[PDB]
Amino acid sequence: AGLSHYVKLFSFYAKMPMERKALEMVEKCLDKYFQHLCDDLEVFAAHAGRKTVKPEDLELLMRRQGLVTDQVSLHVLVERHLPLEYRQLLIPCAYSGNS
Amino acid sequence: LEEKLLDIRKKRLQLKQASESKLLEIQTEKNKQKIDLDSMENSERIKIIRQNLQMEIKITTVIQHVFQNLILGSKVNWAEDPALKEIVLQLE
Amino acid sequence: KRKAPRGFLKRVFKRKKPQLRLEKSGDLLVHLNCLLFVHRLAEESRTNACASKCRVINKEHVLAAAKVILKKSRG
Amino acid sequence: EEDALQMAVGYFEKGPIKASQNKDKTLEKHLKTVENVAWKNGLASEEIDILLNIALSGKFGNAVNTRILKCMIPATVISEDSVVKAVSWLCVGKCSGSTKVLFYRWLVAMFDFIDRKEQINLLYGFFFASLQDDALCPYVCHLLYLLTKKENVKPFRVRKLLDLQAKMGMQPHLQALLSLYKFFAPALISVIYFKNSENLWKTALLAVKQRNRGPSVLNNSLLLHYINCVRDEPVLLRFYYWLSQTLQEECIWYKVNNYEHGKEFTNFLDTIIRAECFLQEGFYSCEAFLYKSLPLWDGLCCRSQFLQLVSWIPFSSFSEVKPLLFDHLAQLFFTSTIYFKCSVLQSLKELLQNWLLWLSMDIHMKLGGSMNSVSKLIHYVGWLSTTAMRLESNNTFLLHFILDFYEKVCDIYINYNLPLVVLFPPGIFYSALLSLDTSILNQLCFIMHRYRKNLTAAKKNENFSSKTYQEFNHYLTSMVGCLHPSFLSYAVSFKWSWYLDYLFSQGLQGLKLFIRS
Amino acid sequence: STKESKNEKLKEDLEREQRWLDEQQQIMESLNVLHSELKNKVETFSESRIFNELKTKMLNIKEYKEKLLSTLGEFLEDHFPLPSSVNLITLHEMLEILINRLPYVKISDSFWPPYVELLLRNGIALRHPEDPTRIRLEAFH
């Protein structure tokens, strides 16, 4: 499903041939990534006091990976990777009705 | 059939040499326009206005392309407006 | 490939944790989380494959890649 | 009703669906049944384009249910795409991504029907900036492929497409857009194709088309005319150089396969010959290649193609072209069968016609040293064709082609205006007169009649005067006194006038023409 | 069998030569009328008159620019600044001035981030590929 789409992304993100048994290991690597993202998100939101998780709870976890910085803000990374309609909903544009 | 073919070939050769003469006249007339171009290469006041055209259309090809991207992104209601209608559909 | 899945990401979030309320576009942001995760994994796998000088990515490179990427990408 | 029904739908659009007393679908389904008969008039298509997608009911099923069959009856007009450019406006309503995909699919599929494609082409950037969307990219790329012009290839668009290629994956739609932008001003270099998912809509588009019906230069004929009209240097020197390097590389290609390469080189020589026949002068790279490749040439290797390039040769002096070419089309002529002797006497028959065409214009365009060259060509072929009947024992199939050559030698003065009436060698005229089949006898008789006509015409406007007339009277007294086993056979098949009429009705046209003298 | 082939290639070549003669007559009349037209149509061009046409282009392009910029003043009131953070018009024109003579900075991260991410999505401006705290107006030239 989502992991299968993600290894399809791995094909064009590694840009170099892979093996099927290796992508089945990338399956468990993605599951192992999420087994940390879901309980890191829970604690980052719990300190925030919200049982829900909001976007700013996730830019902080981004800072925890460190790939978001003072030079590369949260709104920068959405620009480089997500498509146009997939980026419209996160960063506020301006129509006097900023999202 | 061979007589008609010979007649057609003679007509075609006449209209080929005639066309080469006409096209050579047109090309030497283009060469005559080339000294009119040399009448531009004097560059006492053609050069300055040509450079102004190049340095002002490059501003008119920027503000134009920030209208194809500003009558697009915002809450534009682009063509449902008589005003922007003549300013959208911007001439190149 | 220009894709991003709405549904499977939310299903994975619900399966791993039954108590969360991922917001209207928070699915989008966790998908960006994994986008940058897989980007880091791809680039550092290129790096450690160059360390082993192997022209094709293999199990041993990505196994070492896991213990680094999923450890720094951890909060 | 179709207009009234969509105003009724608009009435549903001014109010909530719950507050409405009737279904929003059923009326649109009646409209769909109408579309099954007649989809949308230009004003009707305009209206159903502009309102049903902006903000109102326009359900992502109901809007698509129309958009599948919303195509135009006559065509799409400017006002259709105007207010729906405010549907690509892509905001609080946005005509959401599934109907947006369907919208760009419709814009690709019905792009064949716009009154002014120039207006939409001036809307290039509006669709180009929508290409950033991943869902719209595979269809916006096709739309821009059909929308593109040179004024829309600004370098910022080129770098935006390159940024899209780098950010996204290698895609056939982006590849098609990039190759097209390289076809235009080359700010980028790159080396599927009108592949649409509109095939399901194409059946509907097929019905729409039926309803509309009911209501470097060789392979370019349109540009070959330009080079036909310029005997310039930078055009016939680039052509000389490509043609020579293609008649060399593809001829060296013979020396490795010689079997399947003899069908592309042969089909390339055929295009060469066709281009020369159209342009009517022998390419300067085709005699330069013939002079190089004639000594090496055998009899049958591209025989019909090499002996059609010989026909298209620039008119040169015989003392400078015979040793180079005619000394190898005689070394091969005398050593090959009748099917190469006839294929050279046919080759040189067309060569004579081509040398006479360009000499008639040398009279039209204001001689004696070029005169002696066609005369020498005729005398040399008459030397080829008088010993060819010696090698082949006066073969009638070969004599037919020999007199086919002189079929174009008698009719020089009347036809090409050149004072070059040149008679037979005795060994050809007398062996055609003493032939055994009527089909070459009457050909010789027709050629004699044409010689009569041309000599009489040359007596009018004025060596061609003394020795030619002496030898022609020699031939005349020999034939008119003899005018015979072929005629014996014709008589066996059967009052001198009755016999002549029987001969004349049996296709004896040349004999009748010469007897009428 | 060979005079029937000669007659076949004679009829086919007759049709082909008739087509070629038709296309030759067409480009004969077209070339003659083009020579007649271009005679004393573009040849009657003075250098002074040529520069006057460039001055007419100067005024036409300047009025087109003052049309586009007048609309940039009018329509962008639909945009309007609300509540420094700089007005969208002013920060956009400070983008334009910077790219006008060049820069890759152009705003040095002008404020009101909805406004900078307004003119970034549509292709108006671009981020710097290395240090994304600095902006460039897409180099529309």
Numbering used by the authors:
A (entry chain T): 458 to 556
B (entry chain H): 150 to 241
C (entry chain W): 14 to 88
D (entry chain I): 62 to 252, 260 to 283, 365 to 515, 526 to 621, 631 to 651, 685 to 695, 715 to 737
E (entry chain K): 109 to 191, 205 to 223, 230 to 268
Paper lines:
The CENP-A nucleosome (CENP-ANuc) is surrounded by a group of 16 proteins, the constitutive centromere-associated network (CCAN) and organized in various stable subcomplexes. Human CCAN is composed by five modules of CENP-C, CENP-LN, CENP-HIKM, CENP-OPQUR and CENP-TWSX. The arrangement of the four sub-complexes generates a b-shaped structure, in which CENP-OPQUR adopts an elongated shape to generate the arm, and CENP-LN, CENP-HIKM, and CENP-TWSX form the semi-circle. The CENP-LN sub-complex, located at the center of the ‘b’, functions as a node for coordination of the assembly of CCAN by contributing the contact sites, with the sub-complexes CENP-HIKM and CENP-OPQU on the opposite side.
We reconstituted a 16-subunit human CCAN complex assembled on CENP-ANuc wrapped with 147 bp of DNA using the Widom 601 sequence. Initial 3D classification and refinement resulted in an EM map with an overall resolution at 3.3 Å of CCAN complex, estimated by the gold-standard Fourier Shell Correlation method. Further classifications and reconstructions gave two maps with distinct features in an interior tunnel, representing the CCAN complex alone (apo-CCAN) and CCAN in complex with a fragment of DNA (CCAN-DNA). The 3.3 Å map was of high quality and was used for model building. The CENP-HIKM sub-complex is comprised of the HIKhead and HIKbase domains connected by the anti-parallel coiled-coil α-helices from CENP-H and CENP-K to form a V-shaped structure. CENP-M, which adopts a small GTPase-like fold, is located at a pocket on the surface of the HIKbase domain formed by the C-terminus of CENP-I, the N-termini of CENP-H and CENP-K, and the CENP-LN sub-complex. At the CENP-QU C-terminal, parallel α-helix bundles, extending in a hetero-dimeric coiled-coil, form the vertical line of “b” with CENP-OP and CENP-R at the top. Although we used a fragment of CENP-C containing amino acid residues 180–545 for reconstitution of CCAN on CENP-A nucleosome, most of this fragment of CENP-C is invisible in the cryo-EM map because of its intrinsic disorder. Assisted by AF2, residues 302–306 of CENP-C were assigned to the density associated with CENP-LN subcomplex in concordance with a previously identified CENP-LN binding motif, which supported the kinetochore recruitment of CENP-LN by CENP-C in vivo. The fragment includes residues 260–272 of CENP-C, which fit into the density proximal to CENP-HIKM subcomplex.
